[PDB]
Short mmCIF file of C-alpha atoms and ligand atoms in Angstrom, two decimals:
data_model
loop_
_atom_site.label_atom_id
_atom_site.label_comp_id
_atom_site.label_asym_id
_atom_site.label_seq_id
_atom_site.Cartn_x
_atom_site.Cartn_y
_atom_site.Cartn_z
CA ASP A 1 -49.75 42.47 -21.85
CA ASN A 2 -51.62 41.10 -18.87
CA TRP A 3 -50.07 38.13 -17.09
CA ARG A 4 -52.19 36.02 -14.75
CA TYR A 5 -50.47 34.83 -11.56
CA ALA A 6 -52.05 32.49 -8.99
CA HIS A 7 -50.91 31.54 -5.50
CA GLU A 8 -52.08 29.41 -2.57
CA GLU A 9 -52.54 31.99 0.18
CA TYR A 10 -54.68 34.96 1.17
CA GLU A 11 -54.26 38.71 1.19
CA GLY A 12 -51.16 39.69 3.20
CA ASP A 13 -49.80 36.18 3.58
CA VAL A 14 -46.16 35.44 2.68
CA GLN A 15 -46.93 34.24 -0.90
CA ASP A 16 -49.04 37.30 -1.43
CA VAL A 17 -46.27 39.58 -0.23
CA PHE A 18 -44.01 37.93 -2.83
CA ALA A 19 -46.75 38.19 -5.51
CA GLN A 20 -47.53 41.86 -4.89
CA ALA A 21 -43.84 42.74 -4.91
CA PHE A 22 -43.38 40.86 -8.21
CA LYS A 23 -46.46 42.65 -9.61
CA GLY A 24 -45.14 45.99 -8.38
CA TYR A 25 -41.78 45.56 -10.08
CA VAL A 26 -43.27 44.52 -13.41
CA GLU A 27 -45.80 47.37 -13.38
CA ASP A 28 -43.23 49.99 -12.24
CA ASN A 29 -40.78 49.00 -14.98
CA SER A 30 -42.99 48.14 -17.96
CA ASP A 31 -46.42 48.58 -19.57
CA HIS A 32 -47.43 45.05 -18.52
CA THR A 33 -49.88 44.21 -15.76
CA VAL A 34 -49.81 41.24 -13.37
CA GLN A 35 -53.23 40.00 -12.33
CA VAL A 36 -52.83 38.15 -9.02
CA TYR A 37 -55.31 35.51 -7.90
CA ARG A 38 -55.31 34.59 -4.22
CA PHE A 39 -56.46 31.24 -2.85
CA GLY A 40 -59.94 30.25 -4.01
CA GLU A 41 -60.20 33.05 -6.56
CA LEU A 42 -60.03 30.86 -9.68
CA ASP A 43 -56.14 23.22 -10.17
CA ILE A 44 -53.74 26.17 -10.42
CA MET A 45 -50.89 23.93 -11.53
CA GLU A 46 -53.14 22.38 -14.21
CA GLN A 47 -54.04 25.87 -15.46
CA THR A 48 -50.43 26.92 -15.61
CA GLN A 49 -49.25 23.82 -17.49
CA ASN A 50 -52.04 24.29 -20.06
CA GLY A 51 -51.33 27.99 -20.46
CA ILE A 52 -54.37 29.61 -18.87
CA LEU A 53 -52.09 31.04 -16.14
CA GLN A 54 -48.69 32.57 -16.86
CA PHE A 55 -47.26 32.38 -13.33
CA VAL A 56 -48.00 30.13 -10.36
CA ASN A 57 -46.71 29.91 -6.87
CA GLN A 58 -47.07 26.29 -5.72
CA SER A 59 -45.44 24.64 -2.72
CA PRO A 60 -43.56 21.32 -2.94
CA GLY A 61 -46.15 19.96 -0.53
CA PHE A 62 -48.45 19.82 -3.54
CA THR A 63 -45.97 19.77 -6.43
CA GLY A 64 -44.24 16.71 -4.97
CA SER A 65 -46.96 14.49 -6.43
CA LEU A 66 -46.21 15.63 -10.01
CA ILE A 67 -42.49 16.34 -9.54
CA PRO A 68 -41.24 13.61 -7.22
CA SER A 69 -37.89 15.34 -6.57
CA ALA A 70 -39.77 18.23 -4.89
CA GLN A 71 -40.53 15.80 -2.05
CA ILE A 72 -36.96 16.26 -0.75
CA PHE A 73 -38.16 19.09 1.53
CA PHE A 74 -40.17 16.55 3.52
CA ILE A 75 -37.26 14.46 4.73
CA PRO A 76 -37.38 15.52 8.36
CA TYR A 77 -34.38 17.13 10.07
CA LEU A 78 -32.57 17.64 6.73
CA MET A 79 -33.05 21.43 6.72
CA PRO A 80 -31.38 23.69 9.28
CA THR A 81 -33.51 25.20 12.09
CA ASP A 82 -32.35 28.82 12.10
CA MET A 83 -33.47 31.53 9.70
CA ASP A 84 -30.01 32.87 8.90
CA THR A 85 -28.71 29.46 7.83
CA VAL A 86 -31.81 28.64 5.81
CA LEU A 87 -31.49 31.98 3.98
CA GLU A 88 -27.89 31.31 3.09
CA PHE A 89 -28.89 27.83 1.88
CA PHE A 90 -31.58 29.25 -0.44
CA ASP A 91 -29.14 31.85 -1.77
CA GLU A 92 -26.18 29.50 -2.37
CA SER A 93 -27.53 25.97 -2.91
CA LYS A 94 -26.76 24.41 -6.31
CA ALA A 95 -29.62 22.00 -5.61
CA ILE A 96 -32.02 24.96 -5.34
CA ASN A 97 -30.54 27.28 -7.94
CA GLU A 98 -29.30 24.91 -10.69
CA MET A 99 -30.73 21.40 -10.24
CA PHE A 100 -34.32 22.18 -9.40
CA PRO A 101 -34.90 24.43 -12.42
CA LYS A 102 -33.91 21.52 -14.68
CA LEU A 103 -36.31 19.19 -12.89
CA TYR A 104 -39.17 21.69 -13.19
CA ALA A 105 -38.37 22.28 -16.88
CA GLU A 106 -39.17 18.60 -17.51
CA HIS A 107 -42.77 19.48 -16.61
CA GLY A 108 -43.06 22.59 -18.76
CA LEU A 109 -42.32 25.05 -15.95
CA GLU A 110 -39.74 27.82 -15.75
CA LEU A 111 -38.74 27.85 -12.07
CA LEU A 112 -38.01 31.45 -11.12
CA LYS A 113 -37.58 31.31 -7.32
CA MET A 114 -37.75 28.97 -4.36
CA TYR A 115 -38.07 30.56 -0.95
CA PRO A 116 -38.84 29.67 2.65
CA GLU A 117 -41.98 30.90 4.42
CA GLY A 118 -41.38 29.72 7.99
CA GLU A 119 -40.58 26.86 10.33
CA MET A 120 -43.13 24.02 10.35
CA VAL A 121 -45.11 23.80 13.59
CA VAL A 122 -47.45 20.99 14.57
CA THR A 123 -50.84 21.80 16.01
CA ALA A 124 -52.96 19.17 17.68
CA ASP A 125 -55.57 18.42 20.32
CA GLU A 126 -52.72 17.75 22.77
CA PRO A 127 -48.99 18.54 23.09
CA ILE A 128 -46.85 16.13 21.05
CA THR A 129 -43.61 15.44 22.91
CA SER A 130 -42.75 12.03 21.44
CA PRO A 131 -43.63 9.78 18.52
CA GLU A 132 -45.82 7.83 20.98
CA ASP A 133 -48.02 10.95 21.32
CA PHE A 134 -48.83 10.79 17.60
CA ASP A 135 -50.30 7.26 17.97
CA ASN A 136 -53.78 7.11 16.46
CA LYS A 137 -53.79 10.86 15.70
CA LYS A 138 -55.11 11.79 12.25
CA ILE A 139 -52.70 14.54 11.17
CA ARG A 140 -53.54 16.50 8.04
CA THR A 141 -50.71 16.89 5.51
CA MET A 142 -50.38 18.47 2.10
CA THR A 143 -50.85 15.96 -0.68
CA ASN A 144 -47.53 14.41 -1.66
CA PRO A 145 -46.62 10.78 -1.00
CA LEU A 146 -43.42 11.34 0.97
CA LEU A 147 -44.96 13.72 3.48
CA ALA A 148 -47.52 11.05 4.36
CA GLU A 149 -44.61 8.61 4.86
CA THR A 150 -42.95 11.14 7.18
CA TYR A 151 -46.02 11.34 9.37
CA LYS A 152 -46.50 7.56 9.30
CA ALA A 153 -42.87 7.28 10.38
CA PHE A 154 -43.57 9.68 13.26
CA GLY A 155 -46.47 7.43 14.36
CA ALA A 156 -49.44 9.42 13.05
CA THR A 157 -52.21 8.54 10.62
CA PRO A 158 -51.61 10.95 7.81
CA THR A 159 -54.75 12.31 6.36
CA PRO A 160 -53.59 14.02 3.20
CA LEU A 161 -56.17 16.73 2.53
CA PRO A 162 -56.30 19.88 0.34
CA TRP A 163 -56.20 23.17 2.29
CA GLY A 164 -59.89 24.00 2.07
CA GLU A 165 -60.94 21.03 4.22
CA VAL A 166 -58.67 21.74 7.22
CA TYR A 167 -60.30 24.28 9.57
CA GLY A 168 -63.67 22.50 9.58
CA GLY A 169 -61.98 19.08 9.84
CA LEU A 170 -60.15 20.12 12.99
CA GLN A 171 -63.33 21.66 14.33
CA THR A 172 -65.44 18.49 13.94
CA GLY A 173 -62.67 15.95 14.64
CA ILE A 174 -62.23 14.58 11.12
CA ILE A 175 -58.56 15.31 11.85
CA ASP A 176 -56.71 15.71 15.13
CA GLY A 177 -53.98 18.07 14.00
CA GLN A 178 -51.99 19.60 11.16
CA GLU A 179 -48.65 21.22 10.43
CA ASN A 180 -47.94 24.68 9.10
CA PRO A 181 -45.85 27.78 9.75
CA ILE A 182 -46.92 29.98 12.63
CA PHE A 183 -47.90 32.95 10.40
CA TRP A 184 -50.48 30.73 8.67
CA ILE A 185 -51.70 29.15 11.89
CA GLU A 186 -52.28 32.73 13.03
CA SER A 187 -53.75 34.21 9.86
CA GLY A 188 -56.03 31.22 9.28
CA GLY A 189 -57.20 31.12 12.90
CA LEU A 190 -56.18 27.47 13.24
CA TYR A 191 -55.18 28.00 16.88
CA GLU A 192 -58.91 28.46 17.61
CA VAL A 193 -59.60 24.81 16.77
CA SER A 194 -56.13 23.27 17.24
CA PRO A 195 -54.67 25.00 20.30
CA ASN A 196 -51.60 22.92 21.23
CA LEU A 197 -48.56 24.02 19.28
CA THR A 198 -45.45 21.87 19.22
CA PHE A 199 -42.17 23.11 17.78
CA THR A 200 -40.58 19.89 16.52
CA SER A 201 -37.87 21.62 14.45
CA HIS A 202 -38.30 18.99 11.70
CA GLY A 203 -38.59 21.31 8.73
CA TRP A 204 -39.53 24.52 7.00
CA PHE A 205 -42.52 25.36 4.89
CA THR A 206 -41.05 26.31 1.56
CA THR A 207 -42.50 27.31 -1.76
CA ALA A 208 -41.73 27.99 -5.40
CA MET A 209 -42.77 30.49 -8.04
CA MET A 210 -42.63 29.60 -11.68
CA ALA A 211 -43.87 30.51 -15.15
CA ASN A 212 -45.40 28.42 -17.90
CA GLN A 213 -42.25 27.66 -19.84
CA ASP A 214 -43.71 28.09 -23.38
CA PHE A 215 -44.99 31.49 -22.25
CA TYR A 216 -41.64 32.48 -20.74
CA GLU A 217 -39.64 31.28 -23.75
CA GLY A 218 -41.97 33.29 -26.03
CA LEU A 219 -41.14 36.54 -24.22
CA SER A 220 -38.61 38.93 -25.67
CA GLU A 221 -35.15 38.96 -24.08
CA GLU A 222 -36.09 42.26 -22.41
CA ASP A 223 -39.29 40.84 -20.91
CA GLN A 224 -37.50 37.67 -19.75
CA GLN A 225 -35.00 39.88 -17.90
CA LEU A 226 -37.88 41.95 -16.49
CA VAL A 227 -39.39 38.75 -15.05
CA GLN A 228 -36.06 37.66 -13.57
CA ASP A 229 -35.45 41.08 -12.03
CA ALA A 230 -39.05 41.14 -10.67
CA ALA A 231 -38.55 37.71 -9.08
CA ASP A 232 -35.30 38.92 -7.48
CA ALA A 233 -37.01 42.05 -6.12
CA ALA A 234 -39.91 39.99 -4.82
CA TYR A 235 -37.50 37.51 -3.16
CA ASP A 236 -35.63 40.26 -1.33
CA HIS A 237 -38.86 41.96 -0.17
CA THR A 238 -40.28 38.68 1.05
CA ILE A 239 -37.13 37.66 2.96
CA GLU A 240 -37.31 41.00 4.76
CA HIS A 241 -41.00 40.37 5.44
CA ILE A 242 -40.42 37.00 7.10
CA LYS A 243 -37.76 38.34 9.43
CA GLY A 244 -39.39 38.34 12.84
CA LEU A 245 -42.72 37.18 11.41
CA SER A 246 -42.93 33.90 13.31
CA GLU A 247 -42.24 35.68 16.61
CA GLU A 248 -44.83 38.40 15.83
CA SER A 249 -47.36 35.77 14.77
CA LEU A 250 -46.94 33.80 17.99
CA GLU A 251 -47.40 36.94 20.08
CA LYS A 252 -50.61 37.60 18.13
CA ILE A 253 -51.85 34.06 18.82
CA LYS A 254 -51.09 34.36 22.55
CA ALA A 255 -52.89 37.67 22.68
CA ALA A 256 -55.93 36.11 21.03
CA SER A 257 -56.28 32.89 22.98
CA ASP A 258 -55.66 31.86 26.56
CA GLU A 259 -56.24 28.19 25.56
CA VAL A 260 -53.14 28.00 23.38
CA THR A 261 -50.24 25.92 24.67
CA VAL A 262 -46.68 25.96 23.37
CA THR A 263 -44.36 22.97 23.57
CA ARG A 264 -40.77 23.30 22.40
CA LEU A 265 -39.01 19.95 22.00
CA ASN A 266 -35.63 19.78 23.70
CA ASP A 267 -32.64 18.01 22.25
CA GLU A 268 -33.46 14.57 23.70
CA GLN A 269 -37.06 14.78 22.45
CA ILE A 270 -35.85 15.95 19.03
CA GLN A 271 -33.45 13.01 18.73
CA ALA A 272 -36.37 10.58 19.16
CA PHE A 273 -38.01 12.05 16.03
CA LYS A 274 -34.72 12.27 14.13
CA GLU A 275 -34.40 8.50 14.65
CA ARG A 276 -37.38 8.21 12.27
CA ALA A 277 -35.77 10.32 9.50
CA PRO A 278 -33.47 7.81 7.72
CA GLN A 279 -36.31 5.50 6.59
CA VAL A 280 -38.02 8.53 5.05
CA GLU A 281 -34.82 9.35 3.17
CA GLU A 282 -34.65 5.79 1.80
CA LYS A 283 -38.24 5.98 0.55
CA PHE A 284 -37.37 9.27 -1.13
CA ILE A 285 -34.54 7.58 -3.04
CA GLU A 286 -36.74 4.58 -3.85
CA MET A 287 -39.27 7.05 -5.28
CA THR A 288 -36.73 9.04 -7.30
CA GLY A 289 -33.86 6.68 -8.22
CA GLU A 290 -30.28 7.66 -9.12
CA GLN A 291 -31.46 11.17 -10.10
CA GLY A 292 -32.95 11.59 -6.62
CA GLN A 293 -29.70 10.38 -5.06
CA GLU A 294 -27.81 13.00 -7.06
CA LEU A 295 -30.11 15.78 -5.86
CA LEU A 296 -29.99 14.58 -2.26
CA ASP A 297 -26.19 14.41 -2.32
CA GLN A 298 -26.02 18.00 -3.59
CA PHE A 299 -28.70 19.18 -1.13
CA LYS A 300 -26.63 17.68 1.73
CA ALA A 301 -23.38 19.20 0.35
CA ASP A 302 -25.10 22.57 0.19
CA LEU A 303 -26.26 22.26 3.81
CA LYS A 304 -22.70 21.33 4.87
CA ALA A 305 -21.36 24.41 3.02
CA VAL A 306 -23.58 26.72 5.12
C1 LIG B 1 -48.51 27.92 4.62
C2 LIG B 1 -49.49 27.34 3.64
N1 LIG B 1 -50.17 26.23 3.90
C3 LIG B 1 -51.16 25.67 2.99
C4 LIG B 1 -51.44 24.23 3.25
O1 LIG B 1 -51.00 23.73 4.29
O2 LIG B 1 -52.15 23.60 2.43
C5 LIG B 1 -50.73 25.95 1.56
C6 LIG B 1 -50.46 27.45 1.41
N2 LIG B 1 -49.64 27.96 2.49
MG1 LIG B 2 -51.75 9.08 23.02
MG1 LIG B 3 -53.51 2.76 14.78
MG1 LIG B 4 -46.47 38.30 26.97
MG1 LIG B 5 -59.05 37.88 24.51
#
């Protein structure tokens, strides 16, 4: 059979590395093919829920509108800063590995893997060292309600836009900045039009890969196990890919542009942003109720454990 798989990124980007590794495993261990669509090549969540696509890689930044619990990743300062700790969290978290699949299943999706891509970095038309520096800045975010609340809490004017409108928007001043991992800032050339990078340490860009659940449940036991084993292979390959990637990506940006500036917030500057985090957490629970509180409690337990 041929299984269609869509993701949000371009050739060679972190989601594509995961996708090609998944494809490779399926094709090396079966007679099936995986047809991968990169960004723009086909909405993708709609097409997966209605069965046009078999697999989709969608980030909580977008899925959080449909699946409110996925907004948890946008509570700032909740996630750890360092790669090693984040990796252990994604490996061991009940919230990630048991609770989230149930929440996705409510929407007709078989959640196969969640994984990190890289630390979130702000880019803007000036260095952002305090919430006051965000005042009257239009900062583009992905399109979920809580992420807009995070940026409002930080002092910015969130301008939730889809990805396609971002480069041009920064170029012509529709927006004043954005947030993304360094590998994407590099690969998308965003540093050309948004040259001041600030490492706020507030979060990680994370993503999820899932199947249409009716499709998955219709597969033979053998093929279901093939998919699980492919997802595991892809996860391991991708985790190895992201090791050192942010550092390499930043060196590439510095090599390409003398106009780029890098601001790393110190502990005092970080605390000023962390002061804004609790009211975001309360909005998350007001958006998700007792079920959201249960997830958040487990997510926090899991972070304590690592
Ligand atoms: C890192 C990344 N950013 C996109 C965005 O900010 O819309 C979505 C796909 N991947
Ligand atoms: Mg100002
Ligand atoms: Mg204002
Ligand atoms: Mg150098
Ligand atoms: Mg040069």
